[PDB]
Amino acid sequence: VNKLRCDRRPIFGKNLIDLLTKDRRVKYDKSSIIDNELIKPLQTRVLDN
Amino acid sequence: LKSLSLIAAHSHITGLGLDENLQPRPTSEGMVGQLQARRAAGVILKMVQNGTIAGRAVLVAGPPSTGKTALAMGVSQSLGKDVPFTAIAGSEIFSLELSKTEALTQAFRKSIGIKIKEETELIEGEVVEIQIDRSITGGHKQGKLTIKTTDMETIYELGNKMIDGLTKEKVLAGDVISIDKASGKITKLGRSFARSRDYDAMGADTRFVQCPEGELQKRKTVVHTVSLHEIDVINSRTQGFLALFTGDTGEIRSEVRDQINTKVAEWKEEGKAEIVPGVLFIDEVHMLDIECFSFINRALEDEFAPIVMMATNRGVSKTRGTNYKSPHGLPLDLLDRSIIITTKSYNEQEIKTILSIRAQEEEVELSSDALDLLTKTGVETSLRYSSNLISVAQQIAMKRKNNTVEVEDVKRAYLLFLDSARSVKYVQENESQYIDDQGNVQISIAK
Amino acid sequence: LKSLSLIAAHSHITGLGLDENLQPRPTSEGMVGQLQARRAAGVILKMVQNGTIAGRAVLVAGPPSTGKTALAMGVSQSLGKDVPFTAIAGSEIFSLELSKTEALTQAFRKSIGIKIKEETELIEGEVVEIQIDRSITGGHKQGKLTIKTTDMETIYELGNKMIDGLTKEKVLAGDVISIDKASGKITKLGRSFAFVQCPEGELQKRKTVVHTVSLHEIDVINSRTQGFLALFTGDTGEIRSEVRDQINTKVAEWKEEGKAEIVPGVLFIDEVHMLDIECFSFINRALEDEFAPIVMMATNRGVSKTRGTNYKSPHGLPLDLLDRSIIITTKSYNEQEIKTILSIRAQEEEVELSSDALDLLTKTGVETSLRYSSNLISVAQQIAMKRKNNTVEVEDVKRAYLLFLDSARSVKYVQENESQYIDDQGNVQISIA
Amino acid sequence: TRTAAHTHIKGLGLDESGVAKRVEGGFVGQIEAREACGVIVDLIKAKKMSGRAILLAGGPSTGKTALALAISQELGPKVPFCPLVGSELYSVEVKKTETLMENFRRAIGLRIKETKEVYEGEVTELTPEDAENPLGGYGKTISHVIVGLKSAKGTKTLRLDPTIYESIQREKVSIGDVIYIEANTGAVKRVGRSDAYATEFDLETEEYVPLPKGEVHKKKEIVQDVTLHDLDVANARPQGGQDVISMMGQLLKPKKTEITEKLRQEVNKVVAKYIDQGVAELIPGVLFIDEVNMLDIEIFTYLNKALESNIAPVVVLASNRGMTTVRGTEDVISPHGVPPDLIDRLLIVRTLPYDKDEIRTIIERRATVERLQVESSALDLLATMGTETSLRYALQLLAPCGILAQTSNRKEIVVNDVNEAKLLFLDAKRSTKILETSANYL
Amino acid sequence: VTRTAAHTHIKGLGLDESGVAKRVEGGFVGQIEAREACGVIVDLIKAKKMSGRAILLAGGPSTGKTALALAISQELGPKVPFCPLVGSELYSVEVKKTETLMENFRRAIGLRIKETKEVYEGEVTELTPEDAENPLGGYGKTISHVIVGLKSAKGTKTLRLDPTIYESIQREKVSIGDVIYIEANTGAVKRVGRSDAYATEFDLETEEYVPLPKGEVHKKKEIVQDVTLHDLDVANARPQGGQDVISMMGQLLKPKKTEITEKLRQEVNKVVAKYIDQGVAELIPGVLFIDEVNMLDIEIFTYLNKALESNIAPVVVLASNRGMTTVRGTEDVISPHGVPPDLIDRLLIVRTLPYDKDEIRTIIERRATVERLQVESSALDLLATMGTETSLRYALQLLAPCGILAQTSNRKEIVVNDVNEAKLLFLDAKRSTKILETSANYL
Ligand SMILES: Nc1ncnc2c1ncn2[C@@H]1O[C@H](COP(=O)(O)OP(=O)(O)O)[C@@H](O)[C@H]1O
Ligand SMILES: Nc1ncnc2c1ncn2[C@@H]1O[C@H](COP(=O)(O)OP(=O)(O)O)[C@@H](O)[C@H]1O
Ligand SMILES: Nc1ncnc2c1ncn2[C@@H]1O[C@H](COP(=O)(O)OP(=O)(O)O)[C@@H](O)[C@H]1O
Ligand SMILES: Nc1ncnc2c1ncn2[C@@H]1O[C@H](COP(=O)(O)OP(=O)(O)O)[C@@H](O)[C@H]1O
Ligand SMILES: [Mg+2]
Ligand SMILES: [Mg+2]
Ligand SMILES: [Mg+2]
Ligand SMILES: [Mg+2]
């Protein structure tokens, strides 16, 4: 059990899981615009056609 | 020592032989001669370490087996860790998946590094017991749990959202956990040693840890060293972190690149992230497409342009993608915005000193007359031809089980393995036996 | 109504400018000169409007800066809407993902349109009262609404889907709403008193809606289940020929039944002088099918070498198409014609020109290329703007001319300083000493 | 504080509607060239033309790219500007024509301005207002909902229509929590609990936000810009969480695809519809291409076709070659490698080599930029060297002299330092001579 | 019975303890210098010290180059990795040639891994969940532990398992009477099958039956499986875990080669170095062999220079037969053996000499003995003469149809008439060319 516990410990995330979200995190706020009506994604185009 | 200790071609060289006055010692740091080239390399290294200058291209020139690759390796070694150093070959950029221009862009982005620091407020500690009044009131009756450390222990009051979060990832006390002060994230670190004897077969996730020591909550800062290219790759894809290992980046668009540049500038202004200029080294750049040369010329004039060093052993020859021959194998416009460093062929004394240092590197002792014969052979032949002969002669001496390498062993090794000139002479003398350029060949000895 | 429009090369050209006798006017609809070429273009336009013929290929010729592309743009403008018109470049078909034959087939299919019309009832009126009967944690819900027009006013009981329809978008008494009964779409025509007049006449009326979709869209849709996304992302590859044959049969039987009508269009290829022999060979057979749009081809090259072959062919194309194609030639431009063209360009860009300035611009456009002056006019106006006067003078045009070089002058300067520039062999001199 | 062969150019160095000064904005000489560049800047600022192409040709190290950088600086950050290389267009993923069209669309930008009325503050209380129903019934009827908002330096209570009940129930916000309400659009958005309630618990997973400053009623105008290519790629690329196409984007590799013309024309139509209301404002950009001699003849033909479009922005081309052959054709010879038809469609701007005094001024200005000081004798020696070998060699040699002076603990460079640099560092001509005089394959 | 294909008669170089090659040994004759050089190379490989050393052997066709390249591998032993290669195989459609060369380079060097695992196995006698009566506030309903008894031939034993293993075995759908398999390390549970003791329980049964395992219940063992680093890189780049639907879709897709980044190789190198420092693993350098290197492009030749200077670069050997020729992908660069001069400078050259008439006769005798055929002395002499007249490989190939010809006449010996008939029925290259010179339509 000692060997198993010692071996199961050094499992390192190669970069991180917090680095990823910290680099995703955009300081720019929501700033809602008419872009919601301007984008019209693929699913909406499928639906309305 | 952290890397694999297999002995390679460039193992003896470590750092640069320069002093605080940038004066190269005749024999230091595993390098011999090339005083002017070593001084130029030290100047370039100081230029890189200054970090206030960018977008400079330096050329390394010299005949084959003169020390260009050795000089680049020594420069990288002297630069040390924590500073990016990308070493690629010219033919490597030719990729079926990625355009050559995009490959050059990625290579440039890899060579420049970034340090980012982050601060966290975490509360880590073993929990004593958790009590919730599910029957007295029911529905988040504001239960309480006690967290214990080796030096201190207190009692916390828990809200409704605390109970809802703790229901997921159920905790049965006696476990070491860490709670986030900002987002209130529940993280299970590991169980205590007291639970080690509960069963005889544990689960995959079962682990035991000691009780944390010190204050219940701490303020800590972490610094990460991530280069730009990783940032562009991660931002480009929903899960881009896999693309680093897999290598299928997918020709990242320039829009993401400029967004990343703006983000990096903003972080630098805020002081969260600092920029660490690096070094990009391209070996055997004599072979490359002209489009790559033009792209290099244009991209050398950007703020995030690492110092680029290239090597070439070719004279005035034809450049790939063009019919005409250009000097040094490169177009003249690139040569205009570049500095050329030339290396001269070694001397007999330099050759024998290098051979001695190589033999000492391979834990091989040599007789004086054996060293003199090896130097004499390497003067007529090339220097690189002598090291392989040295290794083979050591193997022969080990076969004979007689201590040091003798002159007879070296002579036998030279007899067994031929030089390029001898092979050319033998081929010319027996040109019928080998396959000619027209495909004609003679097999039968009898006429 | 008006799409994104900016002053471009062919902004002024709007229509051929032809009479009932198909005799071009000297100056009309932005077209000047080229009487025979304009007459031939009008003949082709009348043939296209007739729509009773197919598989006719016409090649226009002439030196650069002659108006062949302008002639094609005028043809497109005179063609009007409801008739497809596809303009592609010669190098556009060299696709890394799609075969050149497949790209040419797609270009051919895109030029033919199909019209299908249907009758959809419409209900439009002013809201009086909206009553929604819901149940919290109850599931089933009810609703009632009252609609009103100028002549009549009744209360309508809504279905389950109608409740969601009127609740997804806010609908009040002060709103004027038209709803299609079959479609279920809810439209807010405008806002009444909380400024649009209440709808008049009958509350419910039936109106006809026509959908126009080119045939290539039908091929893309029926190629695969996920092929609809390719109508926008353009990621479709090697549509099976059986699909095309079945679509052709369906279109033929639809036209026979009168359910739908086909509107043949015009496919225009610019700079056809560059292309592969495979493309020409495929075109030779593609022009012979029933659903072949009339193809207009432009080429300014002389007797040159067709790409993909060592030999040089006249007009830049192999004789196979030239046998089955019709050639329209274009001639150079007279000085007076150049002056009128420059004047119409100035009128398009609302730039005031001095008479002497116009005359010298005409003379320099006769000596140099016409495009040189047609570009220099805007720069001259910009320079004159710095003098705080809304009129271009001789001095402004001279300053613009000395500021910006012509091709011949630049060639002369390069020849005089060949050492400074980069030689074809790669040699170049950069040191002044 | 990093410089790379640039950043010493600050604008075109012109004056108020006149001939550019001798020295201004880090520019020396070539008055005609930058005067023409300023004319072009005025033309693009007019924002009326479409598909106007200019080309500048000259010898190497004659400020060809410097002028493009200068006009980019003069235009301003808001105006889009896309640098490009001749080798950029050769893409494995998609054909060159699609890449060129995508760059063209990326050159054009668009600006959006919006105004919003915001009622925000701490929720003091939520009290419904009862009234008699218009239709007879025993059920409770509510005519208005009373909401009180508290902020720094001001508090207020608002009477609203009772339909806000759904939004207030959805946001799960109760009391003493900052909320955001739009005037005409309605609806509410919870932003976080009031900071005063943070101490109410020993631990908390929910952040507490400070109360809004100023009045509860706010009127802020927001400006957002985006290029047309971003709109096109957003329209084409699917988005979503769990729809099948969403993770069909996953487990695969998203790659550039030839966007159809119907999508582009639909985007143009919706953009025109929005700009007819004054909300949008289209601003054309500038596309910069270097080493245009490296473009294929097919790309040249497609450029000829595309320059006549009604949305094509202003493009600027640079070439340092003269009487050469266009790539893709072994027999066609045209100046600067551009086919004659394309040359007929643009304007040629000449560039002239510099003189010794201009070279010396450039060197001294660069030295001032690099934050290092030289002597008059050393400066003259450097100017002579630049006039002898090349200007760029002298410019590159600056930093090694600074390093050598630093090693000698000196603050200013002397003749000895530049001599050490010249012996340590070689230029093109000496390297070529060494190659000619050596037979060791070097 | 036993198959022979131009090989399998070579068991090694055949060198004595002093390194002197015998005249005839291990299916080899002559080429004493080449055999001595190959033995020296074998000793260097077994030294496990040098890295990146490269040799090249050159000679005319049928001079034993491939034979030597196989004999060196045979002498090395199956433990040390040896990846044969041909210069043509590098060009791959999916990925660039450089990536393939690097992948083969990493395939060449190997590594062995030792780890200890303990396994509980045996027939399931009974299983019993144990539910604690105390809610404790932290959970609603869960089993405190599960007690399972295991039976095997040597004895029986009972176990106490946490809820995770119980959930796993419940997912495995195992009742009383099924032989199961418990791994202590990862908690892996797999159902081997139902014990054969219940075979007669029903007249027919879908389930297969397994005999009761040996060992008491619980065993301790270790695995010394040796795996090269390329497999590690592939596994890291292509994970097999996860039960997500996206993971299954990825598993369905075909495995396409990709340019593995240098960062991943660096991390693999770091963990391997840590393990080898801990003594849990041992690194064994291998040998990479490329045949017909003249087919390589100049780009691959250039990249070989950079590759050979790496730290973990193995020993690579090359084979070529051409002389003064032009490197592929170039225009006029004429270099010996079709190899650029810099690469030749980096490697060592080994020469292979042709064979004498007596040596050819001895080769024919040895080959015929290997094929288990009887050849008359006169017929063997005639075969040696005609092989010296045209080629050795022609005689070696003609050795086969002579056996069938003798069998047709039921004789068991090779007769001059049989070999003459075979020569009549089969023509060599020279006769074919001569008859091709004078013919109507390409013959
Ligand atoms: N200063 C030096 N001291 C010792 N050995 C050197 C030195 N310079 C070069 N070498 C030797 O030269 C070899 C590298 O030659 P290299 O420069 O790669 O040739 P090329 O110029 O063809 O790239 C190495 O094996 C190294 O041992
Ligand atoms: N009749 C005309 N009316 C208006 N513009 C014309 C006329 N003829 C030629 N042009 C102008 O000449 C230019 C070149 O003509 P076009 O056919 O478009 O290209 P090119 O002839 O150079 O291939 C166009 O910009 C067009 O505006
Ligand atoms: N007026 C000027 N003032 C200062 N530096 C200049 C000036 N003109 C050119 N330069 C220098 O010339 C360089 C630009 O070279 P450029 O002529 O664009 O190269 P290419 O000819 O290859 O395009 C810049 O690094 C800049 O330092
Ligand atoms: N010294 C030898 N002893 C026995 N057989 C040999 C010898 N040399 C060559 N051979 C035979 O020649 C055959 C082919 O030779 P190979 O080495 O493939 O030619 P190459 O050198 O052109 O590749 C092999 O099957 C091998 O058995
Ligand atoms: Mg090297
Ligand atoms: Mg035209
Ligand atoms: Mg430039
Ligand atoms: Mg062979």
PDB file of C-alpha atoms in Angstrom, chain B residues 260-341:
ATOM      1  CA  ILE B 260      -3.127  37.381 -28.468  1.00  0.00           C
ATOM      2  CA  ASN B 261      -0.678  40.218 -29.126  1.00  0.00           C
ATOM      3  CA  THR B 262      -3.159  42.762 -27.754  1.00  0.00           C
ATOM      4  CA  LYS B 263      -3.838  40.590 -24.700  1.00  0.00           C
ATOM      5  CA  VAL B 264      -0.111  40.182 -24.031  1.00  0.00           C
ATOM      6  CA  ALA B 265       0.494  43.924 -24.341  1.00  0.00           C
ATOM      7  CA  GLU B 266      -2.367  44.593 -21.924  1.00  0.00           C
ATOM      8  CA  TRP B 267      -0.995  42.074 -19.417  1.00  0.00           C
ATOM      9  CA  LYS B 268       2.490  43.578 -19.680  1.00  0.00           C
ATOM     10  CA  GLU B 269       1.058  47.045 -19.047  1.00  0.00           C
ATOM     11  CA  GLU B 270      -0.797  45.686 -16.005  1.00  0.00           C
ATOM     12  CA  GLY B 271       2.421  43.995 -14.863  1.00  0.00           C
ATOM     13  CA  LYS B 272       0.818  40.556 -14.530  1.00  0.00           C
ATOM     14  CA  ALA B 273       2.934  39.085 -17.341  1.00  0.00           C
ATOM     15  CA  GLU B 274       6.492  39.814 -18.455  1.00  0.00           C
ATOM     16  CA  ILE B 275       8.107  39.002 -21.801  1.00  0.00           C
ATOM     17  CA  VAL B 276      11.290  36.925 -22.016  1.00  0.00           C
ATOM     18  CA  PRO B 277      12.999  37.240 -25.425  1.00  0.00           C
ATOM     19  CA  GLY B 278      14.461  34.019 -26.768  1.00  0.00           C
ATOM     20  CA  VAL B 279      16.693  32.702 -29.555  1.00  0.00           C
ATOM     21  CA  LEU B 280      15.627  30.962 -32.769  1.00  0.00           C
ATOM     22  CA  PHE B 281      18.304  28.860 -34.472  1.00  0.00           C
ATOM     23  CA  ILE B 282      17.904  27.448 -37.984  1.00  0.00           C
ATOM     24  CA  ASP B 283      20.514  24.900 -39.037  1.00  0.00           C
ATOM     25  CA  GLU B 284      21.386  24.026 -42.638  1.00  0.00           C
ATOM     26  CA  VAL B 285      19.413  27.043 -43.849  1.00  0.00           C
ATOM     27  CA  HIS B 286      21.285  26.747 -47.161  1.00  0.00           C
ATOM     28  CA  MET B 287      18.327  24.630 -48.285  1.00  0.00           C
ATOM     29  CA  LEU B 288      14.973  26.469 -48.170  1.00  0.00           C
ATOM     30  CA  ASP B 289      12.442  27.941 -50.566  1.00  0.00           C
ATOM     31  CA  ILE B 290      12.700  31.553 -51.695  1.00  0.00           C
ATOM     32  CA  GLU B 291       9.194  32.179 -50.352  1.00  0.00           C
ATOM     33  CA  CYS B 292      10.482  31.277 -46.893  1.00  0.00           C
ATOM     34  CA  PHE B 293      13.348  33.741 -47.348  1.00  0.00           C
ATOM     35  CA  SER B 294      10.959  36.547 -48.302  1.00  0.00           C
ATOM     36  CA  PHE B 295       8.681  35.756 -45.364  1.00  0.00           C
ATOM     37  CA  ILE B 296      11.690  35.805 -43.030  1.00  0.00           C
ATOM     38  CA  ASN B 297      12.733  39.170 -44.461  1.00  0.00           C
ATOM     39  CA  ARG B 298       9.280  40.608 -43.805  1.00  0.00           C
ATOM     40  CA  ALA B 299       8.791  39.033 -40.365  1.00  0.00           C
ATOM     41  CA  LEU B 300      12.194  40.085 -39.009  1.00  0.00           C
ATOM     42  CA  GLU B 301      10.771  43.625 -38.622  1.00  0.00           C
ATOM     43  CA  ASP B 302       8.218  42.879 -35.884  1.00  0.00           C
ATOM     44  CA  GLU B 303       8.320  43.682 -32.181  1.00  0.00           C
ATOM     45  CA  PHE B 304       7.967  40.026 -31.132  1.00  0.00           C
ATOM     46  CA  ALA B 305      10.805  38.832 -33.367  1.00  0.00           C
ATOM     47  CA  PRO B 306      13.413  36.701 -31.566  1.00  0.00           C
ATOM     48  CA  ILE B 307      17.067  36.864 -32.523  1.00  0.00           C
ATOM     49  CA  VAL B 308      17.586  34.471 -35.436  1.00  0.00           C
ATOM     50  CA  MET B 309      20.889  32.695 -36.090  1.00  0.00           C
ATOM     51  CA  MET B 310      21.503  30.562 -39.178  1.00  0.00           C
ATOM     52  CA  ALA B 311      24.354  28.401 -40.454  1.00  0.00           C
ATOM     53  CA  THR B 312      25.431  27.423 -43.960  1.00  0.00           C
ATOM     54  CA  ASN B 313      28.471  25.607 -45.353  1.00  0.00           C
ATOM     55  CA  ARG B 314      27.611  26.330 -49.002  1.00  0.00           C
ATOM     56  CA  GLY B 315      29.407  28.773 -51.273  1.00  0.00           C
ATOM     57  CA  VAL B 316      28.072  30.632 -54.281  1.00  0.00           C
ATOM     58  CA  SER B 317      25.479  28.104 -55.439  1.00  0.00           C
ATOM     59  CA  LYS B 318      21.908  27.833 -56.683  1.00  0.00           C
ATOM     60  CA  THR B 319      19.038  28.688 -54.349  1.00  0.00           C
ATOM     61  CA  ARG B 320      16.020  26.400 -54.254  1.00  0.00           C
ATOM     62  CA  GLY B 321      13.046  27.678 -56.220  1.00  0.00           C
ATOM     63  CA  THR B 322      15.260  29.781 -58.503  1.00  0.00           C
ATOM     64  CA  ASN B 323      17.379  28.934 -61.527  1.00  0.00           C
ATOM     65  CA  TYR B 324      20.132  31.469 -60.830  1.00  0.00           C
ATOM     66  CA  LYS B 325      22.987  31.040 -58.362  1.00  0.00           C
ATOM     67  CA  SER B 326      23.243  33.436 -55.441  1.00  0.00           C
ATOM     68  CA  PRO B 327      26.265  34.039 -53.193  1.00  0.00           C
ATOM     69  CA  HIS B 328      26.355  31.959 -50.002  1.00  0.00           C
ATOM     70  CA  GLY B 329      23.262  30.072 -51.177  1.00  0.00           C
ATOM     71  CA  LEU B 330      20.899  32.808 -49.967  1.00  0.00           C
ATOM     72  CA  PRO B 331      19.196  35.734 -51.712  1.00  0.00           C
ATOM     73  CA  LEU B 332      20.938  39.080 -51.414  1.00  0.00           C
ATOM     74  CA  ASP B 333      18.040  40.889 -49.717  1.00  0.00           C
ATOM     75  CA  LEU B 334      18.287  38.596 -46.689  1.00  0.00           C
ATOM     76  CA  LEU B 335      22.067  39.049 -46.651  1.00  0.00           C
ATOM     77  CA  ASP B 336      21.463  42.808 -46.541  1.00  0.00           C
ATOM     78  CA  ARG B 337      19.568  42.661 -43.232  1.00  0.00           C
ATOM     79  CA  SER B 338      21.982  40.248 -41.587  1.00  0.00           C
ATOM     80  CA  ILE B 339      25.440  39.953 -40.052  1.00  0.00           C
ATOM     81  CA  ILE B 340      27.793  37.184 -41.182  1.00  0.00           C
ATOM     82  CA  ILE B 341      30.250  35.392 -38.887  1.00  0.00           C
TER      83      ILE B 341
END
